[PDB]
Symmetry: C2
Subunit: 251 residues, 2 copies
Amino acid sequence: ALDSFTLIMQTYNRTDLLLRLLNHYQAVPSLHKVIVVWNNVGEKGPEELWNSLGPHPIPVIFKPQTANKMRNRLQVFPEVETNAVLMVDDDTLISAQDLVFAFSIWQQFPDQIIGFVPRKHVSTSSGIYSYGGFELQTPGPGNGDQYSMVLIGASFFNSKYLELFQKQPAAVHALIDETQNCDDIAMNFLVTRHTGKPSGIFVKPINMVNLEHFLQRSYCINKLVNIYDGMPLKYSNIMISQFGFPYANHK
Amino acid sequence: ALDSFTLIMQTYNRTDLLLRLLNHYQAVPSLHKVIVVWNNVKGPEELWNSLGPHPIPVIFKPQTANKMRNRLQVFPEVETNAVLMVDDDTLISAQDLVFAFSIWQQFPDQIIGFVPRKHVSTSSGIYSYGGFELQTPGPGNGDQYSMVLIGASFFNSKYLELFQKQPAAVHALIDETQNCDDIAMNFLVTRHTGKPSGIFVKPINMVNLAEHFLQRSYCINKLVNIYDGMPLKYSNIMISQFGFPYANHK
């Protein structure tokens, strides 16, 4: 458990999907345990089915949820024993190769969000911020582009941040529930304020496949700026790839 | 001097070439000053000055072929925390330098460079020097590098002072073997930080307008004997600039 991570996955109305993903993820090296946030209330959990198709490499804990909230996966689950958490949306398939590499990167930067989906905030009028990706002009006056966030939906991060998230101003808790989204934007804020460093590091995926309420995202950023009284997100243009994978990719 | 770096370069009979490269490097942002070590026998200085003015001070220092064998010298003229070292047969785009320097600023205790290399061992205690033509020593897939050469690299000037403090056996070894200061530097840096001696930054535009592989294999083993241990740590981290080239993230 000291050299592994816990996969936390939230699902709703995607069962045949969930099981397919699980078949994949259960086999990834260094995976210590899986927690399946069962968001389909008043519905029979797929746990009986999962067990019927056993044995499985690791324990899988299915957890029925009170309501159908987004920040539910951001809860502090007592069954998480690892220092690293791997959060993946129930519609995303990330290769073992990518996970093994990204986890090894997270181990060297334990206090940052190591992930495959980078995003950023921009400003063209003082004090007002907007949410976007590479379709938006870069902030810095220099070359390339910048990112100030790494979405948690496909990332590795310290489990302590989930506990830290619970201690955030209620104002933030409201916002999350009010928009039924924006969690990762709140997490990126949290992490960067805690570390004084860019909230995350972008690890370019070699094989990630998908089987955002942009406007609300922007809205959330400005709201959050009030709450935290400022914009703490730090830009970064660091993109990490695995040396020699694919072969000769260094030249 | 704050947030700036000093370029230390060596030139071997190539005035035309030297001034060409110098015309290039003088205009790289954040460059505070240049130091040119050249083999004596008339200097390039007068010619360089005659074609002034220039953005930064360039200091010419005459040296015998002997001393020049040693690139790990301490020049009192260096006033910056970081040093950029480049062979006089290499043109590194300003874009690579500007980006590489910004990475060095975040990892000032590591060698941020463009040429990765590694050591391998197929028999306990016996190492060999090489590049990607050799099998990865590491865990699973991909490859590994345990060194980043100082030529085409940014690194802390303090390491030059720290080198001077290494055991006499290291100094003697370096003076006996041709190059090998590279090996010494990488050994020195990792021992001091407990981390990979360097981080490989993939160059976008670097051009070469000699690595004594066997001798470097020899030095690694010699240095393993001298330090009584192999400190080189493997890393498979390759850094590239987000968005440069455009959409390179996908």
